Amino acid sequence: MPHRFKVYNYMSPTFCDHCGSLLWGLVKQGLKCEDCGMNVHHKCREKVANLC
Numbered sequence: 001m002p003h004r005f006k007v008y009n010y011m012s013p014t015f016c017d018h019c020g021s022l023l024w025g026l027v028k029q030g031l032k033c034e035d036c037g038m039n040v041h042h043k044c045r046e047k048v049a050n051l052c
């Protein structure tokens with residue numbers, strides 16, 4: 001199974017589980033997988049390992 005990512009709004013320091021970098025911004029800072037809770041930058045979504 002693929003991940004199921006959704007635009008998400010974080011309220012605590014969250015790193016991208018793909019690239020290691022912080023998710024920046026006050027809103028919509030990245031995507032969260034509905035099923036496993038992975039956090040990724042919008043542009044990292046297409047590069048992540050897709051076994052959820």
Ligand SMILES: CCCCCCC(=O)OC[C@H](COP(=O)(O)OCC[N+](C)(C)C)OC(=O)CCCCCC
Binds near residue numbers: 009
């Ligand atoms: C200390 C108790 C648990 C920690 C919660 C920390 C917090 O302050 O923010 C609330 C959860 C925390 O993460 P979540 O509760 O969203 O869970 C992570 C992913 N999954 C839902 C799949 C498990 O998410 C955020 O970071 C921000 C969401 C709200 C954004 C509002 C602008």
Ligand SMILES: C/C=C(/C)C(=O)O[C@H]1C(C)=C[C@]23C(=O)[C@@H](C=C(CO)[C@@H](O)[C@]12O)[C@H]1[C@@H](C[C@H]3C)C1(C)C
Binds near residue numbers: 011022024
């Ligand atoms: C654009 C301006 C800034 C200031 C940022 O990017 O600041 C980022 C930093 C370094 C800490 C912040 C966080 O923990 C936030 C979540 C993340 C997601 O990881 C950080 O992006 C956050 O917005 C929590 C605080 C904001 C802030 C303290 C909010 C949005 C409720």
Ligand SMILES: [Zn+2]
Binds near residue numbers: 034035036037052
């Ligand atoms: Zn997943």
Ligand SMILES: [Zn+2]
Binds near residue numbers: 041
């Ligand atoms: Zn990333």
